[PDB]
Design a protein around this ligand. Structure first.
Ligand SMILES: Fc1ccc(-c2nn3cc(F)ccc3c2-c2ccncc2)cc1
Ligand SMILES: [Cl-]
Ligand SMILES: [Cl-]
Ligand SMILES: [Cl-]
Length: 305
């Protein structure tokens, strides 16, 4: 099968994926030359997920920051999803900036993440896998080159009925699903996740960007279940003011606020964005869209990685 073309119009190119969440490739539409990301998944697999992820992109189609889904089908023993190709993740740019983002970069990146997560909630979905690895910027020279995007909805769940807007019932004793570094306290306790838990996870990412690390990283334990327990115990023990030591206090006020939200309550997204925006007014900075990674390699941007 020389010159492998999947989905009729998509030329398989360069591998950029992992071995756990299906291998991901670069691609080129052979009709118009637009780049795409092509994600493979074994057909007869123990965890089928790529079909519902295709329907999540179609559900969120038209949202600023959600890539377009172009094709989904079966080819051989693989399910194939084709979406827009995007740039590095905020975790990638984090590593390239010395594993520390400036206050101005964190604020501007935060208000775009709150808008993305809000748009997800608007369509009756909760993300439940908030992490900097899944927030991607655009490609070079594009109009949305430095805008934040959201991908990978394998953990997305419907939290309310699309017709009546009846919130999902609250339950407990759930299996811990997610990355323990950012998941909310309620997720450590096995509680059903809702809109408030996507925002508390964002607050953990904000302190992660500002400090360079979280005090519950590098925690050791004999098993993984007890390691998730130690991390969750440090999160309740550490007040938001302690996390915010030396930082603008609006980030601690944000984390405490989203931790106090009722289970089924609609969070004040715009009030949170205005809260993080007042940081720039307190520091005499403008929200002009200038980011730290835009100064890499001599005011040039990232390269070769
Ligand atoms: F269909 C899909 C679904 C998800 C993905 C995807 N997962 N993912 C996970 C990361 F950690 C980083 C990046 C990344 C991508 C991605 C998307 C677009 N452009 C480049 C990379 C690609 C195709
Ligand atoms: Cl579930
Ligand atoms: Cl960790
Ligand atoms: Cl680089």
């Amino acid at each position: 099968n020389n010159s492998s073309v999947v989905g009729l119009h998509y030329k398989i190119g360069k591998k950029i994926g992992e071995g756990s969440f299906g291998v991901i490739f670069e691609g080129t539409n052979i009709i118009n030359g637009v780049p795409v990301a092509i994600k493979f998944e074994p057909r007869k697999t123990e965890a089928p997920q790529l079909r519902d992820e295709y329907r999540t992109y179609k559900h969120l189609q038209g949202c600023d920051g959600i890539p377009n889904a172009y094709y989904f089908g079966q080819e051989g023993l693989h399910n194939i999803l084709v979406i827009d190709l995007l740039g590095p993740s905020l975790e990638d740019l984090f590593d390239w900036c010395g594993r520390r983002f400036s206050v101005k970069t964190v604020v501007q990146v935060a208000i775009q993440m709150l808008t993305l997560v809000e748009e997800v909630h608007r369509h009756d979905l909760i993300y439940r896998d908030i992490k900097p690895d899944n927030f991607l910027i655009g490609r070079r020279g594009a109009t949305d080159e430095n805008n934040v995007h959201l991908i990978d909805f394998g953990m997305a769940k419907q939290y309310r009925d699309p017709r009546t807007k009846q919130h999902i019932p609250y339950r407990e004793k759930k299996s811990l699903s997610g990355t323990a570094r950012y998941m909310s306290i309620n997720t450590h306790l096995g509680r059903e996740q809702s809109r408030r838990d996507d925002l508390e996870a964002l607050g953990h990412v904000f302190f992660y960007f500002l400090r360079g690390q979280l005090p519950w990283q590098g925690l050791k334990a004999p098993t993984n279940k007890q390691k998730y327990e130690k991390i969750g115990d440090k999160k309740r023990t550490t007040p938001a003011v302690t996390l915010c030591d030396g930082l603008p206090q609006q980030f601690a006020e944000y984390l405490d606020s989203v931790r106090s939200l009722p289970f089924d309550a609609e969070p004040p997204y715009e009030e949170y964005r205005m809260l993080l925006l007042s940081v720039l007014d307190d520091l005499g900075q403008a929200c002009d869209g200038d980011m730290d990674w835009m100064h890499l390699n001599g005011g040039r941007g990232w390269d070769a990685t």
